[PDB]
Amino acid sequence: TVTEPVGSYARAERPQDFEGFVWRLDNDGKEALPRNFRTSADALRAPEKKFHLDAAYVPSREGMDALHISGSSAFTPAQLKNVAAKLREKTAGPIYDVDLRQESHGYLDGIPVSWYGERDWANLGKSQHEALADERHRLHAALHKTVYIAPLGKHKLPEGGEVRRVQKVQTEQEVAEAAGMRYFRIAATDHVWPTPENIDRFLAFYRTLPQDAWLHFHSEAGVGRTTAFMVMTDMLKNPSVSLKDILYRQHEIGGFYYGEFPIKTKDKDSWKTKYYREKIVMIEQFYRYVQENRADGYQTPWSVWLKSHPAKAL
Ligand SMILES: [Cl-]
């Protein structure tokens, strides 16, 4: 009897130990665009040394022109508008803001903030219903109230920032719509592989999208969670493309590399190590799901299939 199967390790952590304690500044708004902005129309560039990949390797671009996806970090409303404008030049289809953040976040006086708990796990273990409920309550509770908004220091603790009496509160959905983008939330926990719940939701959503739909994925940094879903979308829309080509091309356009590599972390970040290994295994497990379920149109949901074909630990 296994308590937590591969892909659900995070379920063993205690939520009560990472509760939110401060409104974190998600972006200073000094740049015109969010950080790590990238699209599937972008040219591939040299891989990052840390991933020890083959720089001479030329990944196939098959299906990238019609992939129509992009990724980025969190953003201010103005930055989102700039993103929408840039994407509108590439498509005449609906542009979706796919919010992959489980952590409660929103905008106070137009400032992008999030209720930060240690490890960014303020909503760990909560269902999407509970997470959004927490988010809605906190945002509203901030109106006409004094709050402290601050960026984090090297040890993930408040550093400087500012104090203000909020006069306007907005959800990301509001910001997205005001930017001319449709909105879709997937409460994925930061630093770990998306839950079976997260993926089932995405998969159902993905199946009903128009042919010309453009997906702009984003999380906090625009790296871990953002790349995982960009990778999954790439595999789903281009099942004939090898796992290697998918992983390489998603990384070389500016994303994270989800294949094996010499994982290295500072002592204070040693806790992230097993979660990185788990994601590597689950990336391969999803690829297997796509290859073995595409033929019948994915009649079997990911969560169901996963239980029938559990991934092997690392
Ligand atoms: Cl849920």
Instruction: Please count the other Cβ atoms lying within 10 Å of the Cβ belonging to residue 82.
Output: 18
Contacts of 14 (CB under 8 A, 6+ apart): none
Give the distance (Å) from ligand 1 centre to CA of residue 127. 4
Contacts of 140 (CB under 8 A, 6+ apart): 169
8 A C-beta contact, residue 286 and residue 232:
yes
Is 130 annotated in some ligand binding site?
no
Q: Does an H or E element contain 165, and which?
A: strand 162-165
Angle at 136 between CA 134 and CA 140, to 5 degrees: 120
Is 156 annotated in some ligand binding site?
yes
Is 225 annotated in some ligand binding site?
yes
Q: By what method was this entry solved?
A: X-ray
**Domain 1-28+103-170 CATH (choose: 3.40.1110.10, 3.30.70.1690, 3.40.50.2000, 1.10.1060.10):** 3.30.70.1690
C-alpha torsion angle, residues 29, 33, 38, 40 (rounded to 10): 140
> Which amino acid is it at 286?
F
The phi and psi torsions of 81 (rounded to 5 degrees) equal -60, -40
Q: Which residues pair with 39 in a beta bridge?
A: 70
DSSP string of 180-204? T-EEEEEEEPTTSPPPHHHHHHHHH
List the resolution, Å: 2.0
Picking from 297, 285, 283, 203, the residue whose alpha carbon sits closest to that of residue 250 is 283
Picking from 240, 236, 227, 233, the residue whose alpha carbon sits closest to that of residue 289 is 236
Picking from 178, 109, 170, the residue whose alpha carbon sits closest to that of residue 139 is 170
Residues carrying CATH 3.30.70.1690, the chain: 1-28+103-170
Instruction: Please count the other Cβ atoms lying within 10 Å of the Cβ belonging to residue 272.
Output: 16
Give the distance (Å) from ligand 1 centre to CA of residue 102. 10
What letter does residue 189 receive in the DSSP assignment? Answer: P
Q: Does an H or E element contain 150, and which?
A: strand 146-150
Which protein residues have their CB within 5 A of the ion that is ligand 1? 127-128, 197
Q: Does an H or E element contain 216, and which?
A: strand 214-218
User: 29-102+171-314: which CATH architecture?
Assistant: Alpha-Beta Complex (3.90)
Q: Which residue has tokens 């980025």?
A: 72
Q: Return the CA Rg of the chain.
A: 19
Give the distance (Å) from ligand 1 centre to CA of residue 192. 16
Residues carrying CATH 3.90.190.10, the chain: 29-102+171-314
Give the distance (Å) from ligand 1 centre to CA of residue 200. 10
